[PDB]
Amino acid sequence: FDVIGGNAYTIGGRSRCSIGFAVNGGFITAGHCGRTGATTANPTGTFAGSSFPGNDYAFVRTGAGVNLLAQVNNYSGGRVQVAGHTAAPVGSAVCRSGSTTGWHCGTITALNSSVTYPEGTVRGLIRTTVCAEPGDSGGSLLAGNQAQGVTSGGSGNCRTGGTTFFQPVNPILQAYGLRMITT
């Protein structure tokens, strides 16, 4: 089974979230998607660290038969190569891949933003003009070929527009001592 950024995965049968990025040992996604020990399908895996609220990140460990690719689905029948994870500055054009709305782009308008979800406050977020809908959570945010973050949440939708916040990738890699797959 191929793990590609932006694709749906399921948790207890529910397509709640999208894949963020492939890393050594599995993939990273949003913490609100599930708690440590929860199991996924497509791909088969287990949450092996989750931080939400406060942060919004998680790592899902995958095992045999799962190919971890340095790619993000562009939802036009192609893939985008993930080349690194150098953070882009405010004003940068960024595109999000998620399993509900596909590929949508916008610009970074703030860093270290806070939002208050029903569950509590999440801080340290990338604020953007990219739209997202439920199902897109956990999905990839790219500036060109550089991983920026995974979809956390926001307001609005892709029909009328909205504001979407992303958990930056660097703190996730640091939290779990992970390296992004490049090849």
Catalytic positions:
32, 56, 137
If phi > 0 it is left, if psi is from -120 to 50 it is alpha, else beta; for residue 166 that is: beta
Q: How far apart are the first and last CA of the chain?
A: 17
> What residue segments make up the domains of the chain, in order of their start?
1-69+169-183, 70-168
Way it was determined: X-ray
Residues 94/99/101/103 CA torsion (nearest 10 deg): 30
CATH match of 1-69+169-183 with 2.40.10.10: yes
Q: Give yes or no on whether 1-69+169-183 and 70-168 have one common fold.
A: yes
150, 169 contact by CB (below 8 A) = yes
The dihedrals phi and psi of 77, each to the nearest 5 degrees, come to: 90, 10
12, 120 contact by CB (below 8 A) = no
3-state secondary structure 92-160: CEEEEEECCCEEEEEEEEEEEEEEEECCEEEEEEEEECCCCCCCCCCCEEEECCEEEEEEEEEEEECCC
What is the experimental resolution, given in Å to one decimal place?
A: 1.8
Using alpha carbons, list the distances in angstroms from residue 81 to 28, 100, 134: 16, 21, 25
Which CATH number applies to 70-168? 2.40.10.10
